[PDB]
């Protein structure tokens, strides 16, 4: 395996936090440019800004992470997920893993209080 795959990056670990911040910045740009490609590629039902707000929300999940080393593994996993999504190796059934709640309302009787959780003993 002399030559590598198209959107590959040799995995490299940064000792400063600001270089990691620059790389996650560039990576958000790379996801965000490729969202029309994903909407065309996986033949989804909805609009491009829902993919874009999914991308924003998945970075909103990991904002207050302190440890640089954990930020590094998190960056490498995110770039691998990008490389799978952009090359069309993932399929539409695993692309729509990312959207479990949009596709259908699961049903009536959502338990919120203690009583509705109790009547079905958490189901």
């Amino acid at each position: 395996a002399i030559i590598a795959t198209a959107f590959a990056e040799t995995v490299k670990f940064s000792g400063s936090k600001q270089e990691l911040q620059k790389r996650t910045l560039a990576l958000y740009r790379q996801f965000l440019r490729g969202a029309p490609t994903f909407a065309d590629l996986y033949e989804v039902q909805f609009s491009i800004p829902t993919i874009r707000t999914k991308i924003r929300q998945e970075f909103e999940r990991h904002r207050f992470v302190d440890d640089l080393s954990i930020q590094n593994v998190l960056y490498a996993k995110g770039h691998m997920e990008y490389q799978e999504c952009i090359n069309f190796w993932k399929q539409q059934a695993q692309f729509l893993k990312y959207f479990p709640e949009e596709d259908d309302i699961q049903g009536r009787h959502q338990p919120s209080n203690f009583v509705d959780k109790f009547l079905k003993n958490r189901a």
Binding site: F13, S69, I70, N72, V73
Partner: protein, 112 residues
Amino acid sequence: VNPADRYLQHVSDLHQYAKYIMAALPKYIQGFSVWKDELTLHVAPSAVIPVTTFLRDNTSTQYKSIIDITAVDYPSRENRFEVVYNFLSVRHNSRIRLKTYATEVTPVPSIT
């Protein structure tokens, strides 16, 4: 007869060879273990690349072919995973093992 009795002379030869290998790179070899015609060098992760090159390049070693490399987790250790490398010198008809360590997030450098 004990099937471990046929190994014993070669196991002594393997001992003397490994003591030499430790005396050649004292900066990089933490230990070794000889089980029964099975040699294992015990090396730090920042010491992976300098030992492997030696195992490729020294004429006495010449461990050209990579055979199989993998990991084993011991969750009781602080450095959870250990990473094992198996080599085969097809010149000298010899095998060798190289064991290092790595936690879940900290790396070990690649010999690719």
